[PDB]
Amino acid sequence: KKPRQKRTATKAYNVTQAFGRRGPEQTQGNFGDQELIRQGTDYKHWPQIAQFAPSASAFFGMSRIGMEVTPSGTWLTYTGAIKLDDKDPNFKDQVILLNKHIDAYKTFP
Amino acid sequence: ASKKPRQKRTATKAYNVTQAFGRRGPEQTQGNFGDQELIRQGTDYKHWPQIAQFAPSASAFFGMSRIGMEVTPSGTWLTYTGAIKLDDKDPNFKDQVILLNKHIDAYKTFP
């Protein structure tokens, strides 16, 4: 039922079904290995990924936001960067986990 | 409120958008969203719910976005880009668009 931005992926409604196939196009998402894509927020290390996701206030606070109002459709666009905390004892594990999921689709069979 | 990682911060009247997220401005990775009133008020802005409806859930942030990782002299950064489609068949559509435009780059019109 829900607008795309408010969906929560799970094993019953997975990342592909919720957000489309992972791929190279500007309008496709590129994040997730095979296990994350199948499990969504059921994934065993989801809480470690979700720690980087913005609050509603931070999404509107930190990002560069645009509006593309066209004859074909309107899109709110967003871009930004979130600094990892070097001095967090889990930093090395975070780097590893993010490395596993970013562009992982490139290697799928 | 200020204890939290930046991306989990919640701006309010007591801890405002400038305080939590820095001054609005034109540079990449500097925020550009908010007029004087939203800036002061954060999530106490009367019309915050009509804005927040466009913010993504954590699953959708990682599901919809293009994500990168960049290692620079300033540290390690998780970068992101994406776009959320408005429902142009919703009777509230033009209201929504007016509300978003009112805040996008508002900072250009004041010191």
Author numbering:
A (entry chain A): 256 to 364
B (entry chain C): 254 to 364
Text from the published report:
The protein N is a multifunctional protein that packs the genomic RNA and enhances the efficiency of virus transcription and assembly. N contains an N-terminal domain, involved in RNA binding, and a C-terminal (NCTD) involved in RNA binding, protein dimerization, and interaction with the viral membrane protein (M). The SARS-CoV-2 NCTD folds into a helical core with a protruding β-hairpin employed for protein dimerization. Here we report the crystal structure of the C-terminal domain (NCTD) in open and closed conformations and in complex with guanine triphosphate, GTP.
The crystal structure of NCTD was solved by molecular replacement to a resolution of 1.94 Å. The crystal asymmetric unit contains two homodimers of NCTD with almost identical conformation (rmsd 0.14 Å). Two monomers are intertwined through the β-hairpin forming a four antiparallel β-sheet on one face of the dimer. In striking contrast to the previously described structures, the superposition of the subunits in our structure shows a ≈5.5 Å movement of the β-hairpin. One subunit presents the β-hairpin in an extended and previously unseen conformation that we named “open”. Whereas the other subunit shows a β-hairpin in a flexed conformation that we named “closed”, similar to other structures of this protein. The alternative conformation of the β-hairpin is associated with the structural displacement of the loop between α1 and α2 (residues 280–283). In the closed conformation the β-hairpin interacts with the C-terminal proline residue (P364) of a symmetry-related protein. This interdimeric interaction between W330 and P364 through a π–π stacking (face-to-face rings interaction), and making hydrogen bonds with T325 and S327, is a common feature with seven NCTD structures determined previously. But strikingly, our structure shows that in the open conformation, the side chain of the residue W330 is rotated 180° towards the β-hairpin making hydrophobic contacts with the side chain of the residues T325 and S327. Therefore, our structure shows that upon a side-chain arrangement the β-hairpin changes from an open conformation to a closed conformation that might favor the interdimeric interaction.
